[PDB]
Amino acid sequence: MTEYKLVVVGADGVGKSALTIQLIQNHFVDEYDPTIEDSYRKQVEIDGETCLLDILDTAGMRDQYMRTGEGFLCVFAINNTKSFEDIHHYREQIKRVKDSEDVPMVLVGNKCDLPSRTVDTKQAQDLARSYGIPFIETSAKTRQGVDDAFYTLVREIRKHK
Ligand SMILES: Nc1nc2c(ncn2[C@@H]2O[C@H](COP(=O)(O)OP(=O)(O)O)[C@@H](O)[C@H]2O)c(=O)[nH]1
Numbered sequence: 001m002t003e004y005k006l007v008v009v010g011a012d013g014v015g016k017s018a019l020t021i022q023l024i025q026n027h028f029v030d031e032y033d034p035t036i037e038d039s040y041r042k043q044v045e046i047d048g049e050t051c052l053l054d055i056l057d058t059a060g061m062r063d064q065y066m067r068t069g070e071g072f073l074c075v076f077a078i079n080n081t082k083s084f085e086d087i088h089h090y091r092e093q094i095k096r097v098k099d100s101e102d103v104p105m106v107l108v109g110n111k112c113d114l115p116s117r118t119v120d121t122k123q124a125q126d127l128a129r130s131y132g133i134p135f136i137e138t139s140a141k142t143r144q145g146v147d148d149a150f151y152t153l154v155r156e157i158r159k160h161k
């Protein structure tokens, strides 16, 4: 069984904890302590491979998962322009950690269940294209794109190493 070290990053309130918990416990938490940072393990089969996902949910230890973490989930909320503006910082932070523009990464638009997006799907694709990374729209309330995001990241790690 292979271990995949997965780091979820992004501005506070985007649903980092919600996306993590939905994957692990299969339920939507409406209020998880914004300061709680932890790793959460789950056995998953992705493409006939049994995987141990080691998922650091950054909140603000980190150094290890940033340094030794294999794939990064870059999450903004579609109803939160600032969190999408902040995405540059996190991409930069990762590049700087691993001294490379070739780090497995997925850009994540979360809260796609909410109406009246301020961040267009095209804006987000435009960014991801510019990074050479996938873009996935997710909802931790609906489970929309939730496996897709984590699994695409795993496949990125595999397509990298
Ligand atoms: N409707 C909806 N609310 C969400 C979603 N993801 C997170 N939330 C809510 O957004 C708030 C902040 O989420 P949280 O996971 O604590 O954010 P974090 O700071 O990124 O870890 C909470 O009230 C969550 O229930 C989502 O996909 N849909």
Ligand SMILES: [Mg+2]
Binding pocket: 016, 017, 018, 032, 033, 034, 035, 036, 057, 058, 059
């Ligand atoms: Mg959190």
